[PDB]
């Protein structure tokens, strides 16, 4: 199933960078003008945890040197 939502989709290709694309994190940190948007804040945390899970993974794969630490 999906990592955070309970949806279970199976849209796939059928054979006969990604960390960069998640910093979405900046594109919503939008929260400056909309300080009351609690929906955005909850979804900001979810996207951030995706980064730290990917950050932790790439370090042990030596893709990223272990000095990496994403901030705002």
């Amino acid at each position: 199933g999906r990592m955070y939502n309970p949806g279970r989709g199976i849209s796939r290709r059928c054979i006969p960078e990604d960390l960069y694309f998640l910093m979405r994190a900046v594109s919503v940190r939008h929260l400056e003008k909309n300080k009351k948007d609690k929906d955005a804040k909850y979804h900001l945390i979810l996207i951030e945890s995706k980064i730290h899970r990917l950050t932790r993974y790439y370090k042990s794969a030596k893709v990223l040197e272990a000095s990496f630490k994403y901030d705002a």
Partner: peptide, 10 residues
Amino acid sequence: TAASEAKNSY
């Protein structure tokens, strides 16, 4: 094709 079976409990 995984799609051909793609157009559920536990």
